[PDB]
């Protein structure tokens, strides 16, 4: 099933933001991996991006994905 334990996590949170054109979907990091239960906007970039649900582009990014249908799991 899913996985993300291997070396793959931002020191914490990003900074400026992420372009909506590349951004695909978001995902939360619970369990214990990565700091805080922050959302992870993934894109065709080359790696995962960390961001806490506080900064504007963070709440606005997922809010924009709400309109469309990212086609998530059942």
């Amino acid at each position: 099933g899913p996985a993300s334990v291997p070396t793959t996590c931002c020191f914490n949170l990003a900074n400026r933001k992420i372009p909506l054109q590349r951004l695909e979907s978001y995902r939360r990091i619970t369990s214990g991996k990565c700091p805080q239960k922050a959302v992870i906007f993934k894109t065709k970039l080359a790696k995962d991006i960390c961001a806490d649900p506080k900064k504007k582009w963070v709440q606005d990014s997922m809010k924009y994905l709400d309109q469309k249908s990212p086609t998530p799991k059942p």
Binding site: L13, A14, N15, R16, K17, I18, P19, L45, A46, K55, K56, W57
Partner: peptide, 16 residues
């Protein structure tokens, strides 16, 4: 510190 929030994020684009 710095500025965790600003317009654009890949002004270079070619960064890819």
């Amino acid at each position: 510190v710095e500025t965790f929030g600003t317009t654009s994020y890949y002004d270079d684009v070619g960064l890819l």
